[PDB]
Write an enzyme that holds these catalytic residues in place. Structure first.
Site, mmCIF file in Angstrom:
data_model
loop_
_atom_site.group_PDB
_atom_site.id
_atom_site.type_symbol
_atom_site.label_atom_id
_atom_site.label_comp_id
_atom_site.label_asym_id
_atom_site.label_seq_id
_atom_site.Cartn_x
_atom_site.Cartn_y
_atom_site.Cartn_z
ATOM 1 N N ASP A 492 22.092 19.560 19.685
ATOM 2 C CA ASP A 492 23.367 20.273 19.659
ATOM 3 C C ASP A 492 23.572 21.077 18.373
ATOM 4 O OD1 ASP A 492 26.133 20.884 20.530
ATOM 5 O OD2 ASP A 492 26.754 19.410 19.025
ATOM 6 N N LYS A 580 37.795 18.887 12.823
ATOM 7 C CA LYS A 580 36.770 19.296 13.806
ATOM 8 C C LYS A 580 37.163 20.468 14.712
ATOM 9 C CE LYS A 580 33.824 16.387 15.956
ATOM 10 N NZ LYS A 580 32.449 16.729 15.480
ATOM 11 N N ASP A 761 25.812 24.680 24.273
ATOM 12 C CA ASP A 761 25.201 24.812 22.952
ATOM 13 C C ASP A 761 24.324 23.606 22.606
ATOM 14 O OD1 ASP A 761 27.312 22.969 22.584
ATOM 15 O OD2 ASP A 761 27.490 23.537 20.468
#
Length: 832
Positions: A492, A580, A761
RNA sequence: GGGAGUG
DNA sequence: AGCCGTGCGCACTCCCTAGTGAGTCGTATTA
DNA sequence: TAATACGACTCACTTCTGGCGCACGGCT
């Protein structure tokens, strides 16, 4: 496709499917696709024996009389009339009863414009798929070893009766309601089965028209549409028809658009690399991880489950009933509204869980399963079925690849890396990740021994995914380095958004903070922001603002100052997790107000629910403060990415603008759709159009005019505001979308990689091919940003287009940095 | 307008 | 033409949420 | 035309759970 017979269109999918994969699976595939439908019809017979033989004859008679009435009259015939003459009146009746019963049993309301809409859609789909469905049904309802079956059918061998297909409904939403309303109108007469009771007459926000089921019938009483495939999915050859096989359902569109027209822009494009990528991803053979399923079936049934996600299990009643005076009525009402909220969230999460398990159980014993793939109006690749390798921890854990490749040393190395990743050990150098596994060798092995007795894996970030690793880790220790392994190892990207912005502008910087540059330490951009936040946080703790009383009208509330709020956050600890989502979404054109909403949902609320948020006296004010701190601290960490977005925002703002002249209404230039082509040749058009509402004028039962407000499907004017606020996220999303697709192609063609686990991703393959993939993702990215400047290419697309007196408002263009793209290849922690 | 999940 | 009030909060996907009828008029449609 | 349907516009009948600033529709 329209040139084939219905007999032919129903037989061809079966035949070509029975030739490549045998008739056994050919039947199951169709049964599975029509099972939706099959159950819809089954639920209707329930509900049949346990008055129905009196409703249907009455309804059919009314329909025929209504046609005779309309035909005799002059002038404009009712809108629903012509659309209701496409199907035999007998069937028109059946559907109405069936749909109305489905709408009222599962849902407790129910709005008229919902039922009317449901009936409308059920009619059209019968009109054009009814016969082909009936004919195709014959195949799996008769009576009553494998390989090479995981081989994909050749595109050039596909019969033309499988290629095309209309994926969009020709019917207007307005036209669709007309049909439903008039069917309900004829259902109340005759029988009347259901009554139309008006609710909240007078309230601007609550007034509605709801269909109520009559008391006589009431006392006499997820979603299987998109499931996995048992055979390899049909290759995408054109805009429609790929993925699934059945011809009596409605094909899938390659690109999920907001209108038929938007999809039609792809009809004759020629984008080989795009089709290739989807087809390879689509063709990945998966299977159910029996061992993980064996655990998931038992633990999710426990009253006090060791995993922090799994919801009740228990309805959990309202507290608690205290005297009835001033602030004792508060009370309570806050705690109750919290429970009503908790329960709602819990119910939807439980239903999901139940479904994912039901799916995993069905396909538990299948040699291999497949997932058809789609794309959104931008690049991003989506699995069509509900049960996906792209789901949450449990759903991912329950899945695994079907075919293995030998196997050890090289693979075993990255197998331990993935295990470390599944646990809260992903911001640490590889040699240390291995050290974490080797230290917990007794913690592992024992969890594969008796997972129901050992709940250590449950405490990890990805409980089920880590458990899947443990079962696979124990296999190596017992069989050796030749032990056949097929677990997908996910690589990732750190901060996908900021990674691409850093690459497209060659930001140093930048780099770097998102791990694009070779470093001995793992760069955490989320930790860097929080670190800066804590410095601002400590600053307000000793010298900030005191509490005020804004007294807005009891009514008066306390507004907390910067001192008090800072104390509340230090008492919670603001780590990387708090920043985040807030750090990522900025790189998608977000604002301060937007952050507040995130921090509240992601951090504050669950803390109150977890009993660790007792500190947040004024929750929303604490969310606003933290949003303000991030907005400031992040601002000076992603400077170049911000200018990049502002260049895109301006471009889209000016394009979506309508011209104006000196008093003259001269239409020098209209509003424009933003268009660009992604590196692997995929074209994307951004056409956010203004949502408008229309109203219908229906003389219901010759008594009143039923006038339902509905959300128009007919296009209007381009929404200039959305064009600006959506250009940044949609551009990079299409950008990381192509990078993903180019990765698949380059990994499949230069290396022997056949299986892929793709989550936008994140890139996953079997341990043996992991090394190549880990290397493939870099090569494909370095290659894209070296070959072409996407911002220059995009500029070459929209201007031209620009007017004049518009180009003086248009910047920039973001200056190129000092990043060397080749360094990515030497980057260890830039997984993507 | 909500609820869930992904990035 | 200019003013003041109401609407909206970065994307994408999937699941439970399109204020109301009456009065009046124009219009596209068909025996 | 004569009749019919309907769209288009106008007008009136467990929780408040927030914030702040900017853009656009609705109004006169």
């Amino acid at each position: 496709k329209n040139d084939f017979s219905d007999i032919e269109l129903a037989a061809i999918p079966f035949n070509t499917l029975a030739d490549h994969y045998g008739e056994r699976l050919a039947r199951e595939q169709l049964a599975l696709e029509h099972e939706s439908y099959e159950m819809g019809e089954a639920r209707f017979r329930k509900m049949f024996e346990r008055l129905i033989t009196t409703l249907l004859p009455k309804m059919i008679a009314r329909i025929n009389d209504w046609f005779e009435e309309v035909k005799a009259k002059r002038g404009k015939r009712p809108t629903a009339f012509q659309f209701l003459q496409e199907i035999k009146p007998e069937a028109v009746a059946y559907i109405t009863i069936k749909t109305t019963l489905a709408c009222l049993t599962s849902a407790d309301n129910t709005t008229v414009q919902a039922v009317a809409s449901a009936i409308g859609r059920a009619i059209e789909d019968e009109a054009r798929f009814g016969r082909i469905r009936d004919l195709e049904a014959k195949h799996f309802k008769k009576n009553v070893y494998k390989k090479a079956f995981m081989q994909v059918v050749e595109a050039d061998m596909l019969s033309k009766g499988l290629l095309g297909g209309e994926a969009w409904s020709s019917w207007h939403k307005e036209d669709s309601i007309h049909v439903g309303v008039r069917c309900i109108e004829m259902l109340i007469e005759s029988t009347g089965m259901v009554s139309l009771h008006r609710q909240n007459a007078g309230v601007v926000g609550q007034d509605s028209e709801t269909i109520e089921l009559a008391p006589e019938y009431a006392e006499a009483i997820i979603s299987l549409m998109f499931q996995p495939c048992v055979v390899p999915p049909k290759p995408w050859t054109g805009i429609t028809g790929g993925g699934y096989w059945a011809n009596g359902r409605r094909p899938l569109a390659l690109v999920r658009t907001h209108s038929k027209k938007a999809l039609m822009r792809y009809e004759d494009v020629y984008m080989p690399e795009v089709y290739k990528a989807i087809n390879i991803a689509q063709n990945t053979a998966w299977k159910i991880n029996k061992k993980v399923l064996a655990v998931a079936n038992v633990i999710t049934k426990w009253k006090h489950c060791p995993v922090e996600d799994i919801p009740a299990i228990e309805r959990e009643e309202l507290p608690m009933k205290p005297d009835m005076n001033p602030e004792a009525l508060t009370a309570w009402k806050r705690a109750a509204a919290a429970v009503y909220r908790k329960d709602k969230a819990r119910k939807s999460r439980r239903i999901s869980l139940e479904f994912m398990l039901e799916q995993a159980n069905k396909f538990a014993n299948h040699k291999a399963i497949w997932f058809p793939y789609n794309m959104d109006w931008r690049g991003r690749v989506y699995a069509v079925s509900m049960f996906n390798p792209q789901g949450n921890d449990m759903t991912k854990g329950l899945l695994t690849l079907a075919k293995g490749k030998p196997i050890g040393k090289e693979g075993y190395y990255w197998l331990k890396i993935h295990g470390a990743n599944c646990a809260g050990v992903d911001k640490v150098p590889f040699p240390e990740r291995i050290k974490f596994i080797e230290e917990n060798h007794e913690n592992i092995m024992a969890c594969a021994k008796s997972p129901l007795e050992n709940t250590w894996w449950a405490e990890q970030d990805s409980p089920f995914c880590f458990l899947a690793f443990c079962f696979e880790y124990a296999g190596v220790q017992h069989h050796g380095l030749s032990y056949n392994c097929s677990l997908p190892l996910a690589f990732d990207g750190s901060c996908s958004g900021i990674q691409h912005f850093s690459a497209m502008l060659r930001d140093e910087v930048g780099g770097r903070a998102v791990n694009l540059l070779p470093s001995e330490t793992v760069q955490d951009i989320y930790g860097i922001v929080a670190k800066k936040v804590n410095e601002i946080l400590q600053a307000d703790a000793i010298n900030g603002t005191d509490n005020e009383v804004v007294t807005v009208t009891i009514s008066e509330k306390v507004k907390l100052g910067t001192k008090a709020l800072a104390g509340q956050w230090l008492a919670y600890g603001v780590t990387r997790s708090v920043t985040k989502r807030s750090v990522m979404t900025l790189a998608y054109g977000s604002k301060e107000f937007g952050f507040r909403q995130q921090v509240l949902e992601d951090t504050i609320q669950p803390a109150i629910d977890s009993g660790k948020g007792l500190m947040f006296t004024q929750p929303n004010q604490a969310a606003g403060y933290m949003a303000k701190l991030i907005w400031e601290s992040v601002s000076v960490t992603v400077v170049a990415a911000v200018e990049a977005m502002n260049w895109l925002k301006s471009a889209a703002k000016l394009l979506a603008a309508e011209v104006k002249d000196k008093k003259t209404g001269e239409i020098l230039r209209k509003r424009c759709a933003v268009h660009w082509v992604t590196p692997d040749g995929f074209p994307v058009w951004q056409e956010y159009k203004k949502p408008i509402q229309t109203r219908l004028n229906l003389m219901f039962l010759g008594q009143f005019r039923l006038q339902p407000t509905i959300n128009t499907n007919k296009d209007s004017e381009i929404d200039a505001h959305k064009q600006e606020s959506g250009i940044a996220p949609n551009f990079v999303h299409s950008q990381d979308g192509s990078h993903l697709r180019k990765t698949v192609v380059w990994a499949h063609e230069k290396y022997g990689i056949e299986s892929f686990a793709l989550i936008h991703d994140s890139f996953g393959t079997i341990p043996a091919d992991a090394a190549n993939l880990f290397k493939a993702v870099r090569e494909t990215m370095v290659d894209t940003y070296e070959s072409c400047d996407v911002l220059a290419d995009f500029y070459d697309q929209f201007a031209d287009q620009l007017h004049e007196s518009q180009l003086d408002k248009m910047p920039a263009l973001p200056a190129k940095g000092n990043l060397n793209l080749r360094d990515i290849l030497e980057s260890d922690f830039a997984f993507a």
